[PDB]
Design a protein around this ligand. Structure first.
Ligand SMILES: [Mg+2]
Ligand SMILES: [Mg+2]
Ligand SMILES: [Mg+2]
Ligand SMILES: [Mg+2]
Ligand SMILES: [Mg+2]
Ligand SMILES: [Mg+2]
Ligand SMILES: [Mg+2]
Ligand SMILES: [Mg+2]
Ligand SMILES: [Mg+2]
Ligand SMILES: [Mg+2]
Ligand SMILES: [Mg+2]
Ligand SMILES: [Mg+2]
Ligand SMILES: [Mg+2]
Ligand SMILES: [Mg+2]
Ligand SMILES: [Mg+2]
Ligand SMILES: [Mg+2]
Ligand SMILES: [Mg+2]
Ligand SMILES: [Mg+2]
Ligand SMILES: [Mg+2]
Lengths: 60, 75, 65, 117, 113
RNA sequence: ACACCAACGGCGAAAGCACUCUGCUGGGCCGACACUGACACUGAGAGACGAAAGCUAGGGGAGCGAAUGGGAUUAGAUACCCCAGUAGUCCUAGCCGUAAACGAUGGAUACUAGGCGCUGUGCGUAUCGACCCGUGCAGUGUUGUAGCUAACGCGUUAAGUAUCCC
């Protein structure tokens, strides 16, 4: 069903914001129905983006 | 290229990776994970040498004089 | 500034729907359980207890229903 | 004393008491209401009821200043989290936003131990 | 196509203050391109996306002592091939500048999922 | 000190290792004959590593908090609870070598039903790129047949059937 066909990075914000919560929390693998490999790569990505202020830790 | 499985080539590859590892072990002294590996590989090389000493005396002495390997502990 | 929960009240406002919307926002982020959790200190053991308990609770609630 | 049309209400709900402060967007405090300042003491001071009268008591002075719209700030795990909101509502003042500000460390100062009770 | 001969592939993002002109920006560009090429970079490929509001407010102190609080920012993107040895100074050299508010560099691995 | 991710998930010889990143490096596993040709397994002595508390020397000191002090509670309370709070916790360079250091299970090899799962890869299929399926390995988890056991239980990751060393 849902899948990643495009290279996932910290700069594809559309992608990463799918897998982020309203509060900017990272959603679990069981929810996102991703292979473990994927999920890890997402996670690190999100953190990197978070540091570069592409996505917020907390909200306004 | 030559024999990549030959005793003498292997012992070389080992002696070389060890003297290489030596610099890293000198710069970062706190890395025990790496040292443990060093001790393992040195063990391997020492084994092969003992083997080779059993099998061929000549090839052995030639080798440890060639690669500057310290003389054996059976003396 | 910062915020955890955002409840914006429109002008259709009545007290109970507002109160419960907010209540489910707090249930949704799990903030009160959170501050009952960080009230005191837990050794790694009560963390593994809490993880197994809560995770397998909501997980077996997902696999039964 | 100061007539301010729109401002913010901070309500801190702790387990032993709830404080309700009223301020304005300039980040300036106008008037506050504590559950202890209403003539409640240690036990009762935590009950959602004392929080109710605390909230009502602040909003008295805020309508006395003639203010209309407000934002609500809720900080802390205690009971008044839900109770105070009600009084904010029935006190007939327009509710703009209701936010939860309870601070969540992302890691940090190691909390006190567990009471063995 | 990209083909490093005994080099590592890299990406680097830099975040700069919004108060900058295009000439000061291109001067920075020029400068860092030169540090890379002076460090043994074959293929310096730079790309720019400027002026986006940040997720959050960041603070940068200057050499003039200014406290600068920002909201927007200038993102510079760098694909380049440098020896693993030479990546060392670059990062600090980016930290040290007052114009560069937030820097980060990543090694790039081939994706296989 | 590193929320969410986090999982009855990952690596590590064990101790342990998690915000992010880069660099130096240790292992692992898999597929191909490319090669050597028994070079194996174990290990008395010996060596290295080895939670936390502890110690020597220099830094550092927010929070927590032995000791200590006050407040209570109690017949008493040198305790539990509360208010304060020093060592210590942190870093550098060392010493100490002990833990329910636990799988309470030394190591290697061979061989003996399955069912349901996961992690890594490989193959064939599915499309010609993500699944998908069936399978080959390598590890990891839960039920359970034979057999074992004083019972509990263990059960291809044995506590089964045998061989070797400590
Ligand atoms: Mg109480
Ligand atoms: Mg393992
Ligand atoms: Mg490696
Ligand atoms: Mg032959
Ligand atoms: Mg011994
Ligand atoms: Mg020692
Ligand atoms: Mg210690
Ligand atoms: Mg002492
Ligand atoms: Mg204290
Ligand atoms: Mg006392
Ligand atoms: Mg204190
Ligand atoms: Mg030490
Ligand atoms: Mg012992
Ligand atoms: Mg024992
Ligand atoms: Mg499937
Ligand atoms: Mg197996
Ligand atoms: Mg079991
Ligand atoms: Mg069983
Ligand atoms: Mg037995």
């Amino acid at each position: 069903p849902i899948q990643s066909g495009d290279r996932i990075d910290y700069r594809n914000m559309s992608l990463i914001s799918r897998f982020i919560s309203e509060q900017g929390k990272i959603l679990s693998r069981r929810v996102n129905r991703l292979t473990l490999k994927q999920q890890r790569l997402i996670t690190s990505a999100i953190k990197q983006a978070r540091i570069l202020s592409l996505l917020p830790f907390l909200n306004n | 290229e030559e024999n990549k499985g030959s005793v003498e080539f292997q012992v070389f590859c080992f002696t070389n990776k060890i003297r290489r590892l030596t610099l890293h072990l000198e710069l970062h002294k706190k890395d025990y994970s790496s040292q443990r590996g060093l001790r393992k590989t040195l063990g391997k090389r020492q084994r092969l040498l003992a083997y080779l000493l059993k099998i061929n005396g000549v090839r052995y002495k030639e080798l440890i004089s060639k690669l500057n390997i310290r003389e054996l502990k059976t003396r | 500034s910062a915020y955890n929960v955002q409840v914006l009240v429109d002008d259709n406002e009545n007290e109970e729907r507002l109160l419960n919307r907010f209540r489910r926002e707090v249930m949704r982020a799990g903030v009160i359980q959170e501050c009952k959790r960080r009230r005191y200190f837990e050794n790694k053991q009560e963390e593994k207890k809490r993880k197994h308990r809560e995770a397998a609770k909501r997980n077996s609630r997902r696999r039964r229903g | 004393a100061r007539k301010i049309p729109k401002g913010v209400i901070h309500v801190q709900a702790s387990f032993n008491n709830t404080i309700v402060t009223v301020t304005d967007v300039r980040g300036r405090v106008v008037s506050w209401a504590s559950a202890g300042t209403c003539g409640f003491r240690g036990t009762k001071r935590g009950t959602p009821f004392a929080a109710q009268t605390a909230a009502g008591n602040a909003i008295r002075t805020v309508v006395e200043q003639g203010m209309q719209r407000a934002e609500v700030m809720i900080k802390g795990p205690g009971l008044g989290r839900d109770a105070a909101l009600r009084a904010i509502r029935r006190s007939g003042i327009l509710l703009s936003f209701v936010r939860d500000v309870t601070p969540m460390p992302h890691n940090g100062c190691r909390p006190p131990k567990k009471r063995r009770v | 196509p990209q083909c490093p001969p005994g080099l590592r592939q890299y990406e680097t993002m830099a975040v700069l203050r919004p108060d900058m002109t295009e000439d000061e920006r291109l001067t920075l560009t020029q400068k860092y391109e030169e540090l890379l090429v002076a460090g043994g970079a074959m293929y310096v490929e730079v790309f720019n996306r400027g002026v986006i509001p940040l997720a959050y407010s960041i603070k940068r102190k200057n050499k003039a002592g200014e406290t600068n609080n920002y909201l927007d920012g200038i993102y510079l993107l760098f694909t380049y091939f440098t020896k693993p040895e030479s990546i060392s100074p670059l990062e600090a050299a980016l930290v040290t500048d007052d114009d560069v508010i937030r820097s980060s560099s990543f090694k790039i691995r081939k994706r296989k999922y």
